[PDB]
Structures are given as structure tokens and as C-alpha cells.
Design a protein around this ligand. Structure first.
Ligand SMILES: Nc1ncnc2c1ncn2[C@@H]1O[C@H](COP(=O)(O)OP(=O)(O)O)[C@@H](O)[C@H]1O
Ligand SMILES: [Mg+2]
Lengths: 271, 161
């Protein structure tokens, strides 16, 4: 039918326009994202420089656990939220199977949505309105505050995010987060001086905030890129469908002209 | 199924009751059930008085089970009644034609066998000018007015038919 094809064509045309605009704005944001990422990357890795140079093995004995997942509040980026989701839920399954209770923070409305009916019973808190604005340090300070005011002093923890590799690839990484107890117990920390419960406590809290900030920056970037390429794919596929439906539209309109002409001719021939 | 006849019913109620100008209703090829319901709803609403005639609406009905010529000329019959009430009465008449596409399609059905080559879609070669000779009698002259409320059937919601 000619009018059906006309309507479907107009729909796919405005959809392709929408996806092209989204690709444009997503690339525009990704510009500033990867501009800000590099100094923040130097920063957030200089923070972990100690837990690297000290080789904190981690608690092999402790029971509870805290699991953070970094995402945004906007879908339509790709397999970002799905990747974080699958890794988080697999990891929770294997930790509860091993006799270790775990409770989970979700930064981003998307991860909370996609994992809430899955593991609501094992869930601490969630945060929203992350992803619209370029994440800053204030984000990390707030998330760390409500991670500490939670009263849930975790044995250990792991943050899960999408390490930005570059414009096309991202890797679901899991960074470790230690507690005061074993960072104090770690014999490697006997080379550092002037340390006791108080200063290690302050340092652990501030490093929690730092690693959350660096992870947010690693995830904001590595989402605008995924969104840009996904919208590129969407616009390309929409234009392919537009071309094929346009072929079918021309075919149908030629057939319509032929059919009406044959009607008129057969009607004239009966006189 | 969009609500044309119920719309013309609302219009009949409000306008024809709030008017003093001898309305006319021309039923051009519409359902007999709806025509009977409209008649009986006009009677009980006082617009038609069977006793001591004070009625203010004249009804003309050429319905669906009639041949195409009848459904093509019943709109002209309604026209003629309203034209009397304007020409030789000075009144400002209302003319509810429902439905006029039935008039057009009855024209199509007469042209079918009237021995004439068909135009586009299937209508007559004489569609535009015959519907025009009909629709130009509906006008406001210096003698009176005929405001016409016409319900029009659009086949398959096309609007380009
Ligand atoms: N007040 C109302 N409440 C419910 N349905 C209504 C009302 N007024 C009109 N309708 C619906 O409007 C639809 C169109 O009726 P009709 O006037 O015969 O359509 P049309 O004249 O456009 O062919 C019907 O399905 C009828 O039930
Ligand atoms: Mg109707």
C-alpha cells in the first residue's frame, strides 16, 4: 500500500535524523570528556601508586564485602550497563556461594534499575543524576560520604567500571578497595612511618573518594564514545532501511499507476 | 466511525433548536436505523410537532437501499426545499446534508452504466462540475441565506479521494 509505505518512510526518516543529532551531541560531549580524563587519570593512578608499591594482598579471611558499580542514568549507549550488570551479578553469585555476604552500591540509575529485581536483598544504596553533567570531584566526595555514613564498614570492596581503552573499545575493570584493618595488618606497610589507626583511616577514606572520582571519569568517558558509535550505527541502519523502503515505494507507485490505467482502459473498451 | 453523525446530531440539537429559520435535513443515502432514530429523537425533543404543526425542520430521506439515481437526487430535493424557504420566504435557512459523499458515490454509480469512460479512481468524468452545479445553489443571496452543515464521508480516511 502506498500510504503505509509513506508513513513508515517518514517515521524512519525522522528517526534517522534523531540518531544523527544524538551522535553529533554525544561526540561533542566526548571531546570534553577525553580532555578532562587524562589529568584525572594521572591523578587517580597516583593515588593507587601506594597500594601498588606496597602490594596489599587483601583480606583472605574476612566475610562481608562491598561492591560498587559505575554506570550512568541514560541507556542507549551500547553494552556498557549490560557489561557492568553481568559482571556484578556473576561476582555476587560467586561471592555468596563462597560464604561471603556482599552488599552493592550502584552509581547510575541504569545499573540500579537493571540489577534491582535481581539482587534487591543484597543492596546498600544507589545514586542518580550522574551522566548528564561531566562528573567532578564533588560527585566522589558525596558518594564516599554516603558510603561511610552508611555505617557498613566493609571487609573489602571492589568498584566495577568501564575502563576507557579508546574510542571503540572499553574494558569492564574491577578495582580493589581495602579496609583499615588489613591495610594496617599488611606487613608491607611497616616500611611507612608515622602511621597508626588515625592517619591510615583518613588516608583510606580519602583514597576511596579519589578512586570513585577517577572511576566516574573513566566511565563518563567510555560512554560518550559508545553512545557516539552506537548512534552512528543507528543512523547508518536507518538510512539503509530508508533506501530499501524507497525502492519498494517506487515499485508500488508504478504498480498503482499501471493498475489504474488498466482499469480505465478496460472500462473504455467495453463501449 | 469518527463521529460525523453524532456531531451533526449535536449541531442539530444546539443550532436548530436555537434558531428561528425553518431548518431542513437531507438524508443522502444513510442508514435507515439512524434515520428512524433521528426522527424519533426530533419528535420527542419538540422540534417536530405531529399535532398543531409548529415544526421547524423538514426531513428528506433517500436511504442506502435505494437505486443510485435516488441517492444522487435526494440532495437536490433537500436543496429545493431549503431554496423555497430562502427564495420565497426571506428566511435564513439551515441545511443539514448527511451524507454528501453518498451523493458523490451515487454519481459514480450512475456514470458507471450511463455509457461514459471513467475518470480517476472510479468516479465519473462529470464529478466536479455536477457536484458544483449542486453546491452553488447553497449560498447567501440578497434575498436570504442558506448555511449548510454537510457531513462528508471520506473513504478509507484518505482526504485525497
Ligand atoms: N458521547 C459519546 N459517548 C460514547 N461514544 C460516542 C459518543 N458520541 C459519539 N460516540 C461514538 O462515535 C462513533 C461514531 O459514530 P457516528 O457519528 O455514526 O460516526 P460517523 O458519522 O463519523 O460515521 C460511534 O462509535 C459512537 O459510539
Ligand atoms: Mg455516518
Amino acid at each position: 500500500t502506498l500510504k503505509d509505505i509513506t508513513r513508515r518512510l517518514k517515521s524512519i526518516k525522522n528517526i534517522q535524523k534523531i540518531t544523527k543529532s544524538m551522535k553529533m551531541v554525544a561526540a561533542a560531549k566526548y571531546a570534553r570528556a577525553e580532555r578532562e580524563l587524562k589529568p584525572a587519570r594521572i591523578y587517580g593512578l597516583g593515588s593507587l601508586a601506594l597500594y601498588e608499591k606496597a602490594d596489599i594482598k587483601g583480606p583472605e579471611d574476612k566475610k562481608k564485602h562491598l561492591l560498587i558499580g559505575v554506570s550512568s542514568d541514560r541507556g542507549l549507549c551500547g553494552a556498557i550497563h549490560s557489561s557492568i550488570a553481568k559482571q556484578m551479578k556473576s561476582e555476587v553469585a560467586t561471592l555468596t556461594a563462597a560464604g561471603k555476604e556482599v552488599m552493592l552500591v550502584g552509581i547510575g540509575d541504569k545499573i540500579r534499575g537493571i540489577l534491582y529485581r535481581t539482587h534487591s536483598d543484597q543492596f546498600l544504596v544507589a545514586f542518580k543524576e550522574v551522566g548528564r553533567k561531566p562528573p567532578t570531584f564533588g560527585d566522589a566526595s558525596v558518594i564516599a560520604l554516603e558510603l561511610l555514613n552508611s555505617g557498613y564498614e566493609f571487609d573489602e570492596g571492589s568498584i566495577i567500571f568501564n575502563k576507557f581503552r579508546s574510542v571503540i573499545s572499553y574494558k569492564t575493570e574491577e578495582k580493589p578497595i581495602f579496609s583499615l584493618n588489613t591495610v594496617a595488618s599488611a606487613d608491607s606497610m611497616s616500611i611507612y612511618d608515622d602511621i597508626d589507626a588515625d592517619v591510615l583511616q583518613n588516608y583510606q577514606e580519602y583514597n576511596l573518594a579519589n578512586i570513585i572520582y577517577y572511576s566516574l571519569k573513566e566511565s563518563t568517558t567510555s560512554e560518550q564514545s559508545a553512545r557516539m558509535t552506537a548512534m552512528d550505527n543507528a543512523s547508518k541502519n536507518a538510512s539503509e532501511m530508508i533506501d530499501k523502503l524507497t525502492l519498494t515505494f517506487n515499485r508500488t507507485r508504478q504498480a498503482v499507476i499501471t493498475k489504474e490505467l488498466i482499469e480505465i482502459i478496460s472500462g473504455a473498451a467495453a463501449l | 466511525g469518527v463521529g460525523k453523525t453524532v456531531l451533526i446530531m449535536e449541531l442539530i440539537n444546539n443550532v436548530a433548536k436555537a434558531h428561528g429559520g425553518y431548518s431542513v435535513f437531507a438524508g443522502v443515502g444513510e442508514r435507515t436505523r439512524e434515520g428512524n432514530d433521528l426522527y424519533h429523537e426530533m419528535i420527542e425533543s419538540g422540534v417536530i410537532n405531529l399535532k398543531d404543526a409548529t415544526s421547524k425542520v423538514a426531513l428528506v430521506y433517500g436511504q442506502m437501499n435505494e437505486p443510485p439515481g435516488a441517492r444522487a437526487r435526494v440532495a437536490l430535493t433537500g436543496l429545493t426545499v431549503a431554496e423555497y424557504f430562502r427564495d420565497q420566504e426571506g428566511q435564513d435557512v439551515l441545511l443539514f446534508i448527511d451524507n454528501i459523499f453518498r451523493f458523490t458515490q451515487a454519481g459514480s454509480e450512475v456514470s458507471a452504466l450511463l455509457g461514459r469512460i471513467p475518470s480517476a479512481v472510479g468516479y465519473q468524468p462529470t464529478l466536479a462540475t455536477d457536484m458544483g452545479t449542486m453546491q452553488e445553489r447553497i449560498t447567501t443571496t440578497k434575498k436570504g441565506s442558506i448555511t449548510s452543515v454537510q457531513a462528508i464521508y471520506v473513504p478509507a480516511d484518505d482526504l485525497t479521494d
